[PDB]
From a paper:
CoVs utilize the S1 subdomain in S protein on the envelope to recognize the receptor. Consequently, for a virus to transmit to a new species, the gain-of-ability to bind to the cognate receptor of the target species is a prerequisite.
To further elucidate the molecular basis of the cACE2 binding to SARS-CoV-2 RBD, we prepared the SARS-CoV-2 RBD-cACE2 complex by in vitro mixture of the two proteins and then purified via a gel filtration. The cryo-EM complex structure was solved at 3 Å resolution with one SARS-CoV-2 RBD binding to a single cACE2 molecule. Seven residues (L455, F456, Y473, S477, F486, N487, and Y489) on the β1′/β2′ loop of the SARS-CoV-2 RBD contributed 45 contacts with the cACE2, including two H-bonds. Ten residues (G446, Y449, Y453, Q493, G496, Q498, T500, N501, G502, and Y505) on α1′/β1′ loop and β2′/η1′ loop of SARS-CoV-2 RBD formed 94 and 91 contacts to the cACE2 and hACE2, including eight H-bonds and nine H-bonds, respectively. Residue K417 of the SARS-CoV-2 RBD formed salt bridge interactions with residue E30 of cACE2, and D30 of hACE2. In particular, residue D355 of the cACE2 formed three H-bonds with the SARS-CoV-2 RBD, but hACE2 D355 formed vdw interaction with the SARS-CoV-2 RBD. Though the total number of contacts of the SARS-CoV-2 RBD interacting to the cACE2 and hACE2 (143 and 141, respectively) were similar, the total number of H-bonds of the SARS-CoV-2 RBD and the cACE2 was less than that of the SARS-CoV-2 RBD and hACE2 (11 and 13, respectively), which agrees with the binding features to the SARS-CoV-2 RBD.
Author numbering:
A (entry chain A): 18 to 614
B (entry chain B): 333 to 527
The structure:
Amino acid sequence: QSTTEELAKTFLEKFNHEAEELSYQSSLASWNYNTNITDENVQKMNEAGAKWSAFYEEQSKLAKTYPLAEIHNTTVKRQLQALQQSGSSVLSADKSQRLNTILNAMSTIYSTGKACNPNNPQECLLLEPGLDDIMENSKDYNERLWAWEGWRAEVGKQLRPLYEEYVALKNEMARANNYEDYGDYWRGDYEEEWTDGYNYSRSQLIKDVEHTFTQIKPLYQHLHAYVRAKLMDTYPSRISPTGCLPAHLLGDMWGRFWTNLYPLTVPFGQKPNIDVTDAMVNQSWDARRIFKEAEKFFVSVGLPNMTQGFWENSMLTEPGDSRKVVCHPTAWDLGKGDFRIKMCTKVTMDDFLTAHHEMGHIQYDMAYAVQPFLLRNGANEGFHEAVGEIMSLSAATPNHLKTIGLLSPGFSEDSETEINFLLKQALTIVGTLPFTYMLEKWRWMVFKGEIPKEQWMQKWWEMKREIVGVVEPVPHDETYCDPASLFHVANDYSFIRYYTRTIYQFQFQEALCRIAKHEGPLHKCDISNSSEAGKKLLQMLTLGKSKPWTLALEHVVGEKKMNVTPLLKYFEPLFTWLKEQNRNSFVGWNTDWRPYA
Amino acid sequence: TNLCPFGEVFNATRFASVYAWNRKRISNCVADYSVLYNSASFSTFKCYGVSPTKLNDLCFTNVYADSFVIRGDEVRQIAPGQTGKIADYNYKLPDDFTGCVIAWNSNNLDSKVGGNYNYLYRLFRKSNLKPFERDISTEIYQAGSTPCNGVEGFNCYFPLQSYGFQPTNGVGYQPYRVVVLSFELLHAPATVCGP
Ligand SMILES: [Zn+2]
C-alpha cells in the first residue's frame, strides 16, 4: 500500500493550489481597501478574509488526521506541522467565541480609550495623537505625568479583568494544544526538531535570551547612566543621581524606545547631523527617485531588481484626491508574486532610509517565494525585520550618501559626527532591548504561573526596577494592568521578536562586513558595491522556514547560537566614550528610589 | 502558393487549458517560422533537436502545434527531461523532441480583475503520461484504499485545479500562452517543406 508521507504529500499538494488563490484574494481585497477606504471595500475585505480563514481552519482540521510520528521527510514534516496548529479551534464553541469577543473588546477599547486630567475637563484626548504628541515631544514633568497616568488608569483598569479572563482562556487553549501554557505556545516559534545538531528547545530560548542579556548589561548600564546624567539638566529636581529613570520621561508612552530623547542628551550640540533633506529637494528628487536610488543600492550588493509590477501597482506617492488612505509604511506580499509598498513617501531623509527598510522586506519576501506555500516566511519571528534593518544601516552611511551624489565629496566625517550618530543609534536600538526582554519575561512568568493574579502589578514594576532601570512615577495597585497599555499586549502579540531581531542584524552586518573586507570601526561599514556579502545573505534568504533557524543563522554568521558580540562591537567607540564620561558618576541604578515617596 | 494557417494557432481568440491542451495538425505547407522568430513578440523561444536557425531547409511530414496556457515559472517545465506537475501530469515531452517551445506573457488577454479561472490543470494522477498523451478523465484520484463512492471525501481529491490568473499577478504566476511545435518526419513524401 502507501505510507503516511505518500498521503501527506498528496494532501499538501491539494492544500497549496487552493490556499494560493484563497490568500491572494484576501490580500488583493485588503490592498484595495488600504489604497482606497470606502464602505463596500470593507465588506469585500471581510468576505475574502472570512472565506480564507474558514478554508484554512477546515484544512487545519483535515491535516491532523496524519500523525507526524509516521512521517520521516522533514520537508513535508514542517509543512504538516505548520498546518496542524489548531489555534483556538480546540476549545468548545462557547469558549472559542468568548475568547474571540474578549479579544475584540480588548482590541477596540485600546483604540477608543481617551485620557483627561484635572484643571481642564475638556482636555480629554486619545492616545494618538493626543497623548502621543505629549509623550513624544513635551518636556514638562507634570504634562507627561498626567498623560502617562491617565492612559494607564482610564484604559488599563478597563483591561485588567479582560486580560485575566484572556490569560485563563489562552492557557486552556494552549494546554489543549499539548503545551504547558500560552507563553510556551508563543516560544513554540523557536522550537526546532527533526534535525540533529541544530535542535532548539522552547526552554533553550529562555536560557539564550537570559544569557545574551547579561552581556549587554554593562553597555546598557553605561548608556542608562549617561542618559540619567544628561537628563538631570532638563529635570534638575526630578531625577536621582544614583537611582533609575522615571517611566514617563523616556520619549514615548511606555519607554520602549529612547529615540525622541536625542535632543536632550546629544554629545555635541553644535555639530549638526547629516540630514540630506535640503540636498534632496535641491536636486529635484522625487519619491520615484528615492525608490530608484534604493533599488540601485540593493542591486549594488547583488540582490535583484524590483519587478515591473512594483513600479505600477505600489502606492509610492499619496493620492490626495478623494481617498482617505491609511498609509503606514508597509511592504506587501500579495500572494502570487505581487510585491508592493503602500508608503506615503515625502522628500526627506527619514523616508529615504525607511524606503530601504521596506525594500529589504520586499527582497526577503521575493527570496523565499520558491519555497512551498506553508514555508514562505522568515526563519523565525526576527529575521524579516533584521534584513530590513541592516539595509537601512548600510544606506545611512556617509560613505553611501557621498557615492550616490547626495552629499558633496568635499566633506569629512569628524571625530564627533561618529559619536552623535552612534549615540542616537544606541538610543533607538540598545534602549529597547531591556524593555523587550523584561516585558516578554513578565508575560512568560504570568502565563506559566510563577506570578499569581494578586502580584501582576507587583512583579511588573519589580522586574522594571531590576532589569530596565525604570521606576513608576506613582504606585499602581493590583487593579491596574500597565502592560496592557502597550499595543502588543492588549492586541495579543508576541514581543520577543523585537529582541532576537536586534541581535540578529548586528550578527548579519558584522558578518556581511567581514565578507566586504571593510577595515575600520563597525559603524562606518557600507556593504554597497559588494556582491559577495549580498550573495551570502541571499543564500540564507531563499531558505525561508524550510530549514531550522539555527542552521540558517549559521549559514551567514558561522555561529549557531544567538551571539551578541557583534552588537557590542558595533557600539565600541560609544562604549569607550561613555566609560570615559562616566568617571564622576554612578553607573547602575538602585531600585530603592521612588519618585513619589 | 502554399500559405500556412498560422493565424488560427498563434492569433487565435481562445486557448485550451493545459490539462486539455489543443493540438492542431498542419500539413501541405511551405512554412516560414522566421516570420515569428524575428518578431520579438515572444518571451521564451527554445528549439530542441533542430537549431533555432532560419529553418528554411526542412521538409516535414506534418507539424503539430500544441497550444495551452500556464503560468510563468511552469514554462521551464516545457522542456525535454523535465519533471513537475505540467511535465508529469499535464504535458509530456519525450527526450527525442525535435521541435520548439514558444511562450509569451498574456497578462492582458487571459487575466481580468477578480480572477480568470477558465484554465485548468491536472494536479494528481496515478502515474505519468505517455509521450504526447492527453488525460481528460475526471475520475476522482483515490489516494489511499477507501473508495470515494464517486464524490470527494477522505483522501479523495479532484484531478483538476483551476488557474488563478489575475491582472496584477507578478511575472512568475502571470498567465503565459505556450505554443509547442513538433515537426514529425517519418516514411512520407515530406509534403511540408519550406522555401
Ligand atoms: Zn519592517
